[PDB]
Design a protein around this ligand. Structure first.
Ligand SMILES: CCCCCCCCCCCCCCCCCC(=O)OC[C@H](COP(=O)([O-])OCC(O)COP(=O)([O-])OC[C@@H](COC(=O)CCCCCCCCCCCCCCCCC)OC(=O)CCCCCCCCCCCCCCCCC)OC(=O)CCCCCCCCCCCCCCCCC
Ligand SMILES: CCCCCCCCCCCCCCCCCC(=O)OC[C@H](COP(=O)([O-])OCC(O)COP(=O)([O-])OC[C@@H](COC(=O)CCCCCCCCCCCCCCCCC)OC(=O)CCCCCCCCCCCCCCCCC)OC(=O)CCCCCCCCCCCCCCCCC
Ligand SMILES: CCCCCCCCCCCCO[C@@H]1O[C@H](CO)[C@@H](O[C@H]2O[C@H](CO)[C@@H](O)[C@H](O)[C@H]2O)[C@H](O)[C@H]1O
Ligand SMILES: CCCCCCCCCCCCO[C@@H]1O[C@H](CO)[C@@H](O[C@H]2O[C@H](CO)[C@@H](O)[C@H](O)[C@H]2O)[C@H](O)[C@H]1O
Ligand SMILES: CCCCCCCCCCCCO[C@@H]1O[C@H](CO)[C@@H](O[C@H]2O[C@H](CO)[C@@H](O)[C@H](O)[C@H]2O)[C@H](O)[C@H]1O
Ligand SMILES: CCCCCCCCCCCCO[C@@H]1O[C@H](CO)[C@@H](O[C@H]2O[C@H](CO)[C@@H](O)[C@H](O)[C@H]2O)[C@H](O)[C@H]1O
Lengths: 570, 570
């Protein structure tokens, strides 16, 4: 309501001087324009009164004068439109940057409960709506509002009898038409509800054609759908009958209302209360009020749509992340060794809080050691990485870095010290070089020599240069699809460029081939060297060579020790 | 072109009598309507010539007569709209059923290369377009075409000088405006291309916020996006300048063209070549031609859109499935025993033809035996089920049922004999009872007693009745979410109701809990009894108890025999 309009006020505020200039051009053009029916009525009565008089010179002067008025009106409109559009574009730009900045500051839990599609609809559609609502739509309502105001005033000035008549007739007709319109909307909802059901059934059955086939139900589904769409046709016929009636009734009413004005006006002329010019003026103003009422109606719908968008954008713009974005301490070179400690950690994902991942999880990972995490569910093991990068906070317990609770540190800084290599790595739809550069604190500051060096160590340089575009080859989803081994080696190149003291590896037991597996293992060994390594082990070789082995069973470290001492225990 | 219009012809053909009646009402209304500027010009000249004459009785008779004309016109419009809408609805209904029927007849390979979203856009949007293109849009172009035709003819009848003048002036202005319009479209594309890039970047980075966080790149992405949207603003300002110029130029040109007609017309009146009424008639017809040109323009855009839709729908309607839908033999009771044979089967999925799944795969599954399929990739093992249900055909080799190549049999029938229980079952968004009933050849013919019986055997009846709605509980995605064990037991209830001689089980090694695992194993044992079972084994108990064990290595049966004889072999 009142604080909503206050937010729309401040939104247009940085552009107040452009919008004021444009409103000034809009007022000038709209009010000068409103004078034409009045002056046309005077000319109509002049021709009527004097049919024997030569009007060539007046006409030539008037048409030369009107040319000049039209050139001015065109210049004023050009300026007004440019000022309005550019004002909106600046507002939408400020909405895009502000909205994107807030979204990326939110905790992972927020993304867990919010769909990417909805956030993109807010960044696309809602920013467009909100931007034009305080500009184009505000100008549109302002013109229509002034033109109904001037029009109605001019109808009463031209003839207080005919204006009072129109004002007594239109409202009852408009009220009845609104009630008929609301009925027609309900018959439309009934049809579109039924059509939505049929389309959802169709979508489900196409999407699960393998299950449909498997049970020999293609013919059944075809007949089911045919029954649903035959019922839609039944509803659509009822709707069509009500729509035909409405268009007939509103059309007749519109025509008869105009006819009544021509008839009452015709009689007022005969009785000398009015001239033909005066009636012409009245009808032009009445028609202009009609259009202006339409304009105010369209302005109200777009204002409500823009306020709807406004509520959705102020929701994210004002959202305070439930986890700090760039806040906390940084450790010095002397104190940062890369030792990690889990102490009585309890955790369940925000989306599935009913499923406990950790239940009193304690694990001590000393500096420069290789600790192999072993256990049943990989969901539990993979969650360790998420908590170490503080994507989430434990429900209970603490995670410490060199004795410091990771909550007391700058999360951006914490993450710069912890590198990761996934079973299935994520590469953005940009060049290989940009993807590798991403590892650096400053990816625009990396040299081609640094990118090439880590690409050699990661055993990635040969397949990259074997691309026609080389390091300029656009990868990701929207680009060139890479093999699992190729994606992993670029992930290792990125890790090497990051150069973290702590490394978290998730071993890929799902897929690896004779050619890739060798060059990936060789690169992973070079990467693992001189770093605190936490590895979700699947390969027997990494478990035997690891300094320690941790058994994760039902979200707790049940057994911990060297691989050999673990075989002789149970 | 010519065969395209021939298809649109036949589309409207079943509704030819409704559409003819509506066109008749459209022609009547449009041609009677076109007479009003002519008759208004005569009345204008009558008032002008006789200002001293009482016209009250003529006006009252004319307004009573026009009331009757308006009541007729309203009735004709109501009928015309109803006939047009209902004709389109019948056409769209025939397009929905025909299109859905063709889609579900297509082989699984088709769905492998076609997105569900695209098929739903063809069933939603394109059926709507095509249906209104031969109805509403055809009527719209027909009215506008007749009204430009009558209008232009009437402009020449009213004044061949002024009509020739307008015809010499509008085309040069229209050509120049088209060239300026095409330029403005290119500046718009440049802006919207840039905006699409920025939005895609935003979508990717929001969608991969975990990777962005992990490398401390939230601030980098925010600044990257801000750079892209600042560049969009630069393009949008250039576009805004060209749009402002175009609206200024087209506005001025429009106004000056009308002014030229008022001036030339004004001079023709002075020289006695025309009357005020005649000029009024001419301007009304000129304005009506203007609107009609707009109407023909809108009709051409919608005709092209509808032809675009038409090409996409005739593509699927005329597509011949690359695998038979409901064609082939059925075996008798005596000859159907449920014995299966794979002979030198070679296969690679249509989407990934570079990856061979089977390379000379041969496996003999005798009637009433339990064969356990064991091996590395589960992708290979799961493909056996797809080939047995003939969702695909082998590239080489044969699959036989009781000595008959499954290609020679009716695939619907073949599938009625082969049941399946997946690790992750598929349940539609309908009642539990409807989901269970799906197993039957006639799911509407199953009794509540039959559904309850299989639900008891499947150990499903207790959790189903423990639902507030019971067997009426809507499950699937759009409904009540069930546990893995609950979904599996309903899958077993459906299998029991199907009562197949052959059963294909995919053992769920991913998830199973102490409570579910017992009741699911008990139900699976009752289901496995007296049937030819092929089980993708993960549980050691099922491999030891199985009649035979088949080792699948690199898409071939490397070792086959009893579990004990297999341990002493390598
Ligand atoms: C969808 C399908 C729908 C189908 C529906 C079908 C059916 C339709 C529905 C309903 C029926 C239709 C309507 C039928 C009735 C009308 C027919 C009619 O009257 O015809 C001719 C009419 C002839 O009457 P008349 O003698 O010519 O009188 C003409 C004048 O209107 C009388 O006044 P006057 O001409 O003598 O002069 C008026 C005079 C006096 O002033 C006025 O009259 C103007 C007053 C305007 C101001 C309005 C209020 C102001 C606005 C807002 C409020 C502001 C403050 C709000 C604060 C709120 C705080 C909570 O003017 C002034 O003084 C002007 C001064 C400036 C304004 C004054 C200050 C205003 C301040 C405010 O009646 C008939 O002929 C009888 C026919 C009866 C049956 C007709 C057929 C009906 C069919 C249906
Ligand atoms: C986006 C920003 C754009 C900014 C652009 C800015 C610049 C604009 C661009 C360009 C310039 C604008 C145009 C300037 C030139 C026009 C100005 C002009 O002439 O003004 C007054 C005009 C005065 O001339 P006039 O002596 O009054 O002559 C008037 C009549 O038009 C002369 O004829 P009339 O009045 O003596 O009578 C005509 C007569 C003779 O008939 C006709 O004239 C009518 C002919 C119509 C038929 C057309 C062809 C039929 C259609 C289609 C074809 C069918 C078969 C196709 C088969 C194809 C097979 C491949 O009528 C009949 O016989 C009627 C019989 C029925 C029709 C006959 C059968 C037709 C069959 C077809 O010229 C001037 O005043 C001079 C001013 C020069 C500068 C003006 C300022 C220019 C500014 C720009
Ligand atoms: C859905 C559509 C609904 C439309 C409703 C139609 C309503 C009918 C319209 C009737 C119009 C004619 O209305 C008629 O106007 C004249 C002229 O002002 C009035 O006539 C009276 O007042 C005028 C002055 O105003 C005097 O000159 C005249 O001598 C006197 O008789 C009539 O009292 C009135 O009945
Ligand atoms: C569908 C219906 C379409 C018809 C629309 C309504 C037409 C009404 C019928 C004709 C009534 C004629 O009414 C007549 O008009 C003229 C012109 O204004 C009036 O004339 C008055 O104004 C004109 C200026 O236009 C002066 O030149 C004249 O000295 C003055 O008396 C007459 O005093 C009046 O009697
Ligand atoms: C972007 C907008 C472009 C708009 C272009 C504007 C073009 C200029 C319009 C000029 C209109 C006036 O055009 C003028 O009309 C009169 C009246 O017919 C013509 O006049 C001539 O023919 C008429 C008959 O038709 C005779 O009665 C008259 O005595 C004779 O001089 C002039 O030869 C012509 O020049
Ligand atoms: C922005 C410009 C707006 C103005 C639009 C154009 C107006 C032109 C200027 C006035 C010219 C007046 O021209 C004058 O019109 C009248 C009315 O048709 C003509 O009169 C003719 O028709 C009328 C019927 O309407 C008859 O009653 C009359 O007997 C007959 O001669 C005159 O012979 C002509 O000289």
């Amino acid at each position: 309501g009142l604080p909503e309009a206050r937010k729309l006020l401040g939104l247009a505020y940085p552009e107040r001087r452009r919008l004021a200039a444009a409103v000034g051009f809009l007022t000038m053009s709209s009010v000068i324009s409103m004078s034409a029916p009045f002056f046309l009525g005077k000319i109509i009565d002049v021709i009527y009164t004097n049919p024997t008089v030569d009007y060539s010179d007046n006409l030539t002067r008037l048409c030369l004068g009107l040319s000049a008025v039209f050139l001015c009106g065109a210049a004023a409109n050009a300026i007004r439109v440019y000022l309005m559009q550019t004002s909106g574009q600046r507002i939408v730009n400020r909405l895009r940057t502000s909205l994107f900045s807030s979204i990326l500051r939110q905790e992972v839990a927020f993304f867990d409960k919010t769909r990417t599609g909805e956030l993109i609809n807010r960044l696309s559609s809602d920013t467009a709506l909100l931007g034009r609502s305080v500009t184009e739509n505000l100008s549109d309502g302002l013109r229509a509002g002034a033109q109904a105001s001037v029009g109605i005033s001019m109808m009463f000035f031209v003839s207080p009898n005919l204006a009072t008549f129109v004002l007594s007739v239109v409202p009852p007709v408009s009220i009845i038409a609104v009630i008929y319109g609301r009925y027609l909307r309900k018959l439309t909802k009934v049809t579109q509800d039924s059509l939505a059901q049929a389309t959802q059934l169709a979508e489900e059955r196409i999407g699960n054609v393998r299950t449909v086939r498997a049970f020999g139900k293609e013919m059944t589904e075809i007949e089911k759908y045919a029954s649903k769409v035959d019922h839609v046709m039944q509803l659509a016929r009822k709707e069509a009958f009500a729509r035909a009636g409405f268009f007939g009734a509103t059309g007749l009413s519109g025509n008869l209302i105009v006819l009544s004005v021509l008839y009452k006006g015709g009689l007022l002329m005969g009785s000398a209360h009015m001239t033909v010019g005066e009636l012409s003026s009245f009808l032009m103003y009445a028609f202009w009020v009609g259009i202006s009422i339409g304009g105010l109606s369209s302005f109200y719908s777009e204002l409500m749509k823009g306020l709807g968008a406004g509520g959705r954008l102020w929701e994210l713009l004002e959202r305070e992340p439930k986890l700090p974005f760039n806040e906390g301490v940084i450790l010095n070179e002397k104190s940062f060794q890369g030792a990690l400690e889990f102490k009585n950690v309890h955790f369940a994902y925000p989306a599935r809080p009913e499923v406990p991942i950790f239940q009193d999880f304690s694990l001590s990972i000393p500096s420069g050691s290789v600790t192999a995490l072993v256990g049943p569910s990989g969901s539990g093991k993979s969650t360790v990485l998420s908590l170490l990068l503080r994507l989430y906070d434990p429900a209970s317990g603490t995670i410490s870095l060199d004795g410091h609770d990771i909550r007391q540190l700058n999360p951006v800084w914490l993450r710069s010290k912890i590198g990761t290599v996934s079973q299935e790595p994520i590469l953005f739809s940009c060049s290989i070089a940009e993807n590798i550069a991403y590892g650096a604190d400053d990816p625009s500051s990396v040299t081609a020599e640094e990118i090439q060096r880590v690409a050699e160590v990661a055993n990635a340089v040969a397949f990259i240069r074997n691309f026609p575009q080389g390091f300029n080859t656009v990868v990701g989803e929207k680009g060139v699809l890479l093999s699992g081994g190729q994606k992993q080696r670029i992930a290792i190149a990125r890790a090497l460029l990051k150069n973290p003291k702590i490394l978290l590896l998730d071993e890929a037991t799902s897929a690896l081939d004779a050619e890739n597996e060798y060059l990936v293992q060789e690169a992973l060994d070079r990467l693992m060297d001189g770093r605190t390594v936490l590895v979700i082990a699947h390969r027997l070789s990494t478990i035997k060579n690891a300094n320690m082995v941790a058994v994760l069973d039902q979200g707790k470290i049940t057994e911990y020790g060297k691989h050999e001492e673990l075989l002789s225990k149970p």
